[PDB]
Design a protein around this ligand. Structure first.
Ligand SMILES: [Mn+2]
Ligand SMILES: [Mn+2]
Ligand code: NA
Length: 344
DNA sequence: CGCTAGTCGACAT
DNA sequence: CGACTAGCG
Protein backbone atom coordinates (compact mmCIF):
# COMPACT_ATOMS: atom_id res chain seq x y z
CA UNK A 1 0.00 0.00 0.00
CA UNK A 2 0.95 3.63 0.53
CA UNK A 3 3.49 3.46 3.35
CA UNK A 4 2.84 6.02 6.07
CA UNK A 5 -0.40 7.31 4.56
CA UNK A 6 -2.62 6.41 7.51
CA UNK A 7 -0.51 8.42 9.97
CA UNK A 8 -0.15 11.19 7.39
CA UNK A 9 -3.89 11.79 7.01
CA UNK A 10 -4.49 10.65 10.59
CA UNK A 11 -6.68 13.71 11.23
CA UNK A 12 -9.23 12.58 8.64
CA UNK A 13 -10.17 9.45 10.58
CA UNK A 14 -12.65 8.71 13.35
CA UNK A 15 -13.53 5.75 15.60
CA UNK A 16 -16.84 4.25 14.48
CA UNK A 17 -18.98 1.15 14.80
CA UNK A 18 -20.47 -0.63 11.77
CA UNK A 19 -23.93 -0.02 13.25
CA UNK A 20 -23.75 3.26 11.31
CA UNK A 21 -24.18 1.28 8.09
CA UNK A 22 -27.25 -0.63 9.28
CA UNK A 23 -29.49 -1.32 6.30
CA UNK A 24 -26.76 -0.33 3.85
CA UNK A 25 -24.31 -2.15 1.59
CA UNK A 26 -20.62 -2.62 2.40
CA UNK A 27 -17.94 -4.32 0.29
CA UNK A 28 -15.06 -6.15 1.98
CA UNK A 29 -11.40 -6.63 1.05
CA UNK A 30 -11.68 -10.22 2.15
CA UNK A 31 -7.96 -10.96 1.92
CA UNK A 32 -7.26 -9.19 5.12
CA UNK A 33 -9.70 -11.48 6.96
CA UNK A 34 -8.29 -14.43 5.01
CA UNK A 35 -4.68 -13.71 5.95
CA UNK A 36 -5.51 -12.75 9.53
CA UNK A 37 -7.35 -16.06 9.89
CA UNK A 38 -4.62 -18.00 8.11
CA UNK A 39 -2.21 -16.79 10.79
CA UNK A 40 -3.97 -19.00 13.35
CA UNK A 41 -3.59 -22.21 11.34
CA UNK A 42 -0.28 -21.22 9.75
CA UNK A 43 1.52 -24.42 10.74
CA UNK A 44 -1.06 -26.79 9.28
CA UNK A 45 -1.41 -24.67 6.14
CA UNK A 46 2.34 -24.50 5.52
CA UNK A 47 2.72 -28.22 6.23
CA UNK A 48 0.00 -29.01 3.71
CA UNK A 49 -2.09 -30.53 6.49
CA UNK A 50 -5.88 -30.07 6.13
CA UNK A 51 -7.47 -27.15 7.99
CA UNK A 52 -10.49 -24.84 7.67
CA UNK A 53 -10.09 -22.47 10.62
CA UNK A 54 -9.65 -19.35 8.48
CA UNK A 55 -13.07 -20.02 6.95
CA UNK A 56 -14.80 -19.83 10.32
CA UNK A 57 -12.59 -16.86 11.17
CA UNK A 58 -13.93 -14.95 8.17
CA UNK A 59 -17.46 -16.13 8.88
CA UNK A 60 -17.14 -14.52 12.31
CA UNK A 61 -16.82 -11.11 10.66
CA UNK A 62 -19.48 -12.02 8.10
CA UNK A 63 -22.05 -13.03 10.71
CA UNK A 64 -21.14 -9.98 12.76
CA UNK A 65 -21.93 -7.82 9.74
CA UNK A 66 -25.21 -9.68 9.14
CA UNK A 67 -26.28 -9.22 12.77
CA UNK A 68 -26.31 -5.43 12.34
CA UNK A 69 -28.55 -5.49 9.27
CA UNK A 70 -25.58 -4.78 7.00
CA UNK A 71 -25.43 -6.29 3.52
CA UNK A 72 -21.84 -7.44 2.87
CA UNK A 73 -20.27 -7.98 -0.55
CA UNK A 74 -17.11 -10.06 -0.23
CA UNK A 75 -14.49 -9.26 -2.87
CA UNK A 76 -11.50 -11.46 -3.70
CA UNK A 77 -8.30 -10.89 -5.68
CA UNK A 78 -8.11 -12.46 -9.13
CA UNK A 79 -5.45 -12.47 -11.82
CA UNK A 80 -2.06 -10.98 -10.99
CA UNK A 81 -1.40 -7.69 -12.76
CA UNK A 82 0.94 -8.32 -15.76
CA UNK A 83 3.49 -5.85 -14.36
CA UNK A 84 3.43 -7.00 -10.73
CA UNK A 85 4.45 -10.57 -11.60
CA UNK A 86 8.04 -9.98 -10.46
CA UNK A 87 7.18 -8.63 -7.01
CA UNK A 88 4.59 -11.36 -6.39
CA UNK A 89 6.90 -14.21 -7.40
CA UNK A 90 9.65 -12.69 -5.26
CA UNK A 91 7.18 -12.71 -2.37
CA UNK A 92 6.63 -16.37 -3.22
CA UNK A 93 10.39 -16.92 -3.01
CA UNK A 94 10.51 -15.32 0.44
CA UNK A 95 7.50 -17.37 1.59
CA UNK A 96 8.99 -20.66 0.41
CA UNK A 97 12.27 -19.62 2.04
CA UNK A 98 10.56 -19.04 5.39
CA UNK A 99 8.79 -22.38 4.93
CA UNK A 100 11.88 -24.53 4.36
CA UNK A 101 13.95 -22.56 6.87
CA UNK A 102 11.07 -22.87 9.32
CA UNK A 103 11.09 -26.64 8.89
CA UNK A 104 14.86 -26.67 9.45
CA UNK A 105 14.17 -24.71 12.64
CA UNK A 106 11.64 -27.39 13.55
CA UNK A 107 14.45 -29.93 13.18
CA UNK A 108 16.50 -27.97 15.72
CA UNK A 109 13.72 -27.52 18.27
CA UNK A 110 13.59 -23.75 17.79
CA UNK A 111 9.80 -23.60 18.07
CA UNK A 112 9.35 -19.82 18.35
CA UNK A 113 11.53 -19.01 15.33
CA UNK A 114 9.77 -21.88 13.56
CA UNK A 115 6.28 -20.48 14.17
CA UNK A 116 7.45 -16.97 13.25
CA UNK A 117 8.84 -18.40 9.99
CA UNK A 118 5.72 -20.40 9.10
CA UNK A 119 3.54 -17.38 9.83
CA UNK A 120 5.60 -15.40 7.31
CA UNK A 121 5.14 -18.07 4.65
CA UNK A 122 1.37 -17.69 4.37
CA UNK A 123 0.26 -17.97 0.75
CA UNK A 124 -3.45 -17.28 0.38
CA UNK A 125 -4.52 -19.47 -2.53
CA UNK A 126 -7.65 -19.32 -4.67
CA UNK A 127 -8.81 -22.62 -3.16
CA UNK A 128 -9.00 -21.11 0.32
CA UNK A 129 -10.72 -18.05 -1.11
CA UNK A 130 -13.24 -20.26 -2.92
CA UNK A 131 -13.89 -22.15 0.31
CA UNK A 132 -14.70 -18.82 1.94
CA UNK A 133 -16.88 -18.01 -1.08
CA UNK A 134 -18.91 -21.19 -0.58
CA UNK A 135 -19.17 -20.52 3.15
CA UNK A 136 -20.52 -17.01 2.59
CA UNK A 137 -22.85 -17.95 -0.27
CA UNK A 138 -24.39 -20.65 1.92
CA UNK A 139 -25.37 -17.81 4.27
CA UNK A 140 -26.82 -15.74 1.42
CA UNK A 141 -23.83 -13.40 1.21
CA UNK A 142 -22.85 -12.07 -2.22
CA UNK A 143 -19.31 -12.82 -3.38
CA UNK A 144 -17.32 -11.36 -6.27
CA UNK A 145 -13.93 -12.32 -7.70
CA UNK A 146 -12.16 -9.24 -9.06
CA UNK A 147 -10.65 -9.49 -12.56
CA UNK A 148 -7.33 -8.49 -11.00
CA UNK A 149 -6.64 -6.55 -7.81
CA UNK A 150 -9.57 -6.44 -5.38
CA UNK A 151 -8.64 -2.84 -4.54
CA UNK A 152 -9.85 -1.48 -7.89
CA UNK A 153 -13.01 -3.60 -7.77
CA UNK A 154 -13.87 -2.27 -4.31
CA UNK A 155 -13.13 1.27 -5.45
CA UNK A 156 -15.52 0.77 -8.36
CA UNK A 157 -18.25 -0.70 -6.16
CA UNK A 158 -17.97 2.35 -3.91
CA UNK A 159 -17.78 4.90 -6.73
CA UNK A 160 -20.78 3.35 -8.49
CA UNK A 161 -22.85 3.67 -5.33
CA UNK A 162 -23.34 -0.09 -5.13
CA UNK A 163 -21.74 -0.02 -1.68
CA UNK A 164 -21.42 2.83 0.82
CA UNK A 165 -18.22 1.78 2.61
CA UNK A 166 -15.15 -0.41 2.12
CA UNK A 167 -13.75 -2.70 4.82
CA UNK A 168 -9.99 -3.15 4.46
CA UNK A 169 -6.56 -2.72 6.03
CA UNK A 170 -4.86 -1.49 2.87
CA UNK A 171 -4.52 2.26 2.33
CA UNK A 172 -4.41 1.75 -1.46
CA UNK A 173 -8.20 2.16 -1.42
CA UNK A 174 -7.70 5.85 -0.62
CA UNK A 175 -5.37 6.24 -3.61
CA UNK A 176 -8.01 4.64 -5.84
CA UNK A 177 -10.39 7.37 -4.67
CA UNK A 178 -12.79 5.59 -2.32
CA UNK A 179 -15.41 7.71 -0.58
CA UNK A 180 -15.54 5.84 2.73
CA UNK A 181 -12.94 3.36 3.99
CA UNK A 182 -13.34 1.38 7.21
CA UNK A 183 -9.95 0.43 8.64
CA UNK A 184 -8.84 -1.74 11.57
CA UNK A 185 -12.25 -3.32 12.18
CA UNK A 186 -12.24 -6.07 14.80
CA UNK A 187 -14.56 -9.07 15.02
CA UNK A 188 -17.02 -6.98 17.05
CA UNK A 189 -17.42 -4.03 14.68
CA UNK A 190 -15.03 -1.44 16.13
CA UNK A 191 -12.86 0.34 13.56
CA UNK A 192 -11.50 3.57 12.08
CA UNK A 193 -13.27 5.37 9.24
CA UNK A 194 -11.60 7.65 6.70
CA UNK A 195 -13.96 9.70 4.52
CA UNK A 196 -12.62 11.41 1.41
CA UNK A 197 -14.57 14.60 2.13
CA UNK A 198 -12.80 15.01 5.48
CA UNK A 199 -9.34 14.90 3.89
CA UNK A 200 -9.55 18.66 4.33
CA UNK A 201 -9.23 18.22 8.10
CA UNK A 202 -5.57 17.41 7.48
CA UNK A 203 -3.62 20.68 7.49
CA UNK A 204 -0.58 18.94 5.99
CA UNK A 205 -2.41 18.16 2.74
CA UNK A 206 -3.10 21.81 1.93
CA UNK A 207 -4.90 21.92 -1.41
CA UNK A 208 -3.97 18.31 -2.14
CA UNK A 209 -7.38 16.95 -1.19
CA UNK A 210 -8.59 16.59 -4.75
CA UNK A 211 -8.61 12.96 -5.91
CA UNK A 212 -6.19 13.55 -8.79
CA UNK A 213 -3.62 15.41 -6.70
CA UNK A 214 -4.07 12.95 -3.84
CA UNK A 215 -3.39 10.08 -6.24
CA UNK A 216 -0.34 11.95 -7.55
CA UNK A 217 0.90 12.31 -3.97
CA UNK A 218 0.43 8.64 -3.14
CA UNK A 219 2.28 7.61 -6.31
CA UNK A 220 5.13 10.10 -5.85
CA UNK A 221 5.64 9.02 -2.24
CA UNK A 222 6.04 5.44 -3.42
CA UNK A 223 3.42 2.84 -4.32
CA UNK A 224 3.05 -0.79 -5.36
CA UNK A 225 3.26 0.14 -9.04
CA UNK A 226 6.31 2.40 -8.81
CA UNK A 227 9.10 2.97 -6.31
CA UNK A 228 9.59 6.60 -5.30
CA UNK A 229 12.62 8.72 -6.15
CA UNK A 230 15.26 8.51 -3.43
CA UNK A 231 14.46 10.94 -0.62
CA UNK A 232 10.83 11.40 -1.62
CA UNK A 233 8.14 10.70 0.95
CA UNK A 234 4.56 11.82 1.51
CA UNK A 235 5.50 15.23 2.90
CA UNK A 236 7.89 16.26 0.12
CA UNK A 237 5.53 14.98 -2.58
CA UNK A 238 2.67 16.86 -0.96
CA UNK A 239 4.89 19.94 -0.94
CA UNK A 240 5.65 19.46 -4.64
CA UNK A 241 1.96 19.30 -5.47
CA UNK A 242 1.14 22.22 -3.16
CA UNK A 243 3.79 24.58 -4.57
CA UNK A 244 2.94 23.50 -8.12
CA UNK A 245 -0.63 24.14 -9.24
CA UNK A 246 0.45 23.25 -12.77
CA UNK A 247 -2.04 20.72 -14.24
CA UNK A 248 0.62 19.01 -16.37
CA UNK A 249 2.04 16.63 -13.76
CA UNK A 250 4.91 15.51 -16.02
CA UNK A 251 6.54 18.94 -16.30
CA UNK A 252 6.09 19.27 -12.54
CA UNK A 253 7.86 15.96 -11.90
CA UNK A 254 10.72 16.93 -14.22
CA UNK A 255 11.46 19.98 -12.06
CA UNK A 256 10.79 18.40 -8.66
CA UNK A 257 14.19 19.61 -7.45
CA UNK A 258 13.06 23.19 -8.08
CA UNK A 259 10.05 22.81 -5.79
CA UNK A 260 11.88 20.85 -3.09
CA UNK A 261 15.06 22.94 -3.36
CA UNK A 262 16.99 19.69 -3.74
CA UNK A 263 19.25 18.35 -6.49
CA UNK A 264 17.17 15.59 -8.06
CA UNK A 265 17.69 14.04 -11.50
CA UNK A 266 14.60 12.41 -13.03
CA UNK A 267 15.20 9.48 -15.41
CA UNK A 268 12.74 8.90 -18.28
CA UNK A 269 12.08 5.49 -16.72
CA UNK A 270 10.49 7.27 -13.77
CA UNK A 271 8.37 9.43 -16.07
CA UNK A 272 7.03 6.46 -18.03
CA UNK A 273 6.75 4.56 -14.75
CA UNK A 274 4.68 7.38 -13.29
CA UNK A 275 2.44 7.48 -16.35
CA UNK A 276 1.88 3.72 -16.20
CA UNK A 277 1.27 3.87 -12.45
CA UNK A 278 -1.33 6.62 -12.83
CA UNK A 279 -2.93 4.74 -15.71
CA UNK A 280 -3.04 1.67 -13.48
CA UNK A 281 -4.70 3.59 -10.63
CA UNK A 282 -7.21 5.15 -13.03
CA UNK A 283 -7.98 2.48 -15.63
CA UNK A 284 -7.39 -0.93 -14.04
CA UNK A 285 -9.98 -3.38 -15.36
CA UNK A 286 -12.84 -4.22 -13.01
CA UNK A 287 -16.09 -6.16 -13.37
CA UNK A 288 -19.42 -4.33 -13.60
CA UNK A 289 -21.73 -6.60 -11.58
CA UNK A 290 -24.91 -5.01 -12.96
CA UNK A 291 -24.21 -4.88 -16.70
CA UNK A 292 -22.01 -7.98 -16.37
CA UNK A 293 -18.99 -6.84 -18.41
CA UNK A 294 -15.34 -5.77 -18.15
CA UNK A 295 -14.87 -2.03 -17.70
CA UNK A 296 -12.05 0.28 -16.63
CA UNK A 297 -12.28 1.63 -13.06
CA UNK A 298 -12.83 5.11 -14.48
CA UNK A 299 -14.15 5.88 -17.96
CA UNK A 300 -11.43 6.43 -20.56
CA UNK A 301 -10.65 10.09 -21.18
CA UNK A 302 -10.09 11.63 -24.62
CA UNK A 303 -6.38 11.96 -23.85
CA UNK A 304 -5.71 8.32 -23.11
CA UNK A 305 -5.52 5.45 -25.60
CA UNK A 306 -6.94 2.15 -24.24
CA UNK A 307 -4.88 0.21 -26.81
CA UNK A 308 -1.74 0.94 -24.80
CA UNK A 309 -2.93 -0.09 -21.33
CA UNK A 310 -2.11 -3.81 -21.27
CA UNK A 311 -0.40 -3.32 -17.90
CA UNK A 312 -3.70 -2.11 -16.45
CA UNK A 313 -5.39 -5.37 -17.39
CA UNK A 314 -6.48 -7.37 -20.42
CA UNK A 315 -10.00 -7.82 -21.78
CA UNK A 316 -11.71 -11.19 -22.16
CA UNK A 317 -15.19 -12.27 -23.26
CA UNK A 318 -17.97 -10.96 -21.02
CA UNK A 319 -19.26 -14.49 -20.41
CA UNK A 320 -15.77 -15.59 -19.38
CA UNK A 321 -15.44 -12.46 -17.25
CA UNK A 322 -18.73 -13.43 -15.62
CA UNK A 323 -17.57 -16.99 -14.93
CA UNK A 324 -14.34 -15.68 -13.42
CA UNK A 325 -16.15 -13.06 -11.34
CA UNK A 326 -18.60 -15.67 -10.03
CA UNK A 327 -15.62 -17.81 -9.04
CA UNK A 328 -16.80 -20.66 -11.26
CA UNK A 329 -13.75 -20.43 -13.51
CA UNK A 330 -10.23 -20.97 -12.18
CA UNK A 331 -7.94 -17.93 -12.36
CA UNK A 332 -4.89 -19.80 -13.64
CA UNK A 333 -6.17 -22.85 -15.53
CA UNK A 334 -9.38 -21.22 -16.81
CA UNK A 335 -11.12 -24.48 -15.87
CA UNK A 336 -14.67 -24.70 -14.53
CA UNK A 337 -14.15 -25.59 -10.87
CA UNK A 338 -17.69 -24.62 -9.87
CA UNK A 339 -21.15 -23.96 -11.32
CA UNK A 340 -22.85 -21.30 -9.19
CA UNK A 341 -25.85 -19.58 -10.76
CA UNK A 342 -27.11 -16.29 -9.26
CA UNK A 343 -30.31 -16.45 -11.32
CA UNK A 344 -31.98 -19.38 -9.55
C1' DC B 1 11.61 17.88 10.30
C1' DG B 2 11.56 14.17 6.80
C1' DC B 3 12.85 9.75 4.49
C1' DT B 4 14.62 4.89 4.32
C1' DA B 5 15.24 0.17 5.58
C1' DG B 6 14.37 -2.85 8.82
C1' DT B 7 11.83 -5.30 12.62
C1' DC B 8 7.62 -7.00 14.53
C1' DG B 9 2.85 -8.19 15.15
C1' DA B 10 -1.31 -10.25 13.32
C1' DC B 11 -4.34 -15.32 15.66
C1' DA B 12 -5.07 -17.12 20.29
C1' DT B 13 -4.07 -20.09 23.83
C1' DC C 1 -0.38 -5.05 5.38
C1' DG C 2 0.54 -1.24 9.14
C1' DA C 3 2.98 0.29 13.39
C1' DC C 4 7.10 1.55 14.88
C1' DT C 5 12.03 3.10 15.09
C1' DA C 6 17.17 3.50 14.51
C1' DG C 7 20.13 5.82 11.30
C1' DC C 8 20.86 9.35 8.27
C1' DG C 9 20.20 13.67 5.00
MN1 LIG D 1 -5.33 -5.80 -2.47
MN1 LIG E 1 -3.17 -2.89 -2.57
NA1 NA F 1 9.25 6.98 -0.58
Amino acid sequence: GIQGLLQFIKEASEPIHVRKYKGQVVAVDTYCWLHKGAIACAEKLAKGEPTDRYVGFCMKFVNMLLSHGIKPILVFDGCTLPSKKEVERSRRERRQANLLKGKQLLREGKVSEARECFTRSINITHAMAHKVIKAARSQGVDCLVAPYEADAQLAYLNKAGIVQAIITEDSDLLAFGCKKVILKMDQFGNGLEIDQARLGMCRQLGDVFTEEKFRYMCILSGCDYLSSLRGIGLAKACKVLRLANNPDIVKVIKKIGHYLKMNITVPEDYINGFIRANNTFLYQLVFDPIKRKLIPLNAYEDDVDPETLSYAGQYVDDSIALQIALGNKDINTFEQIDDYNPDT
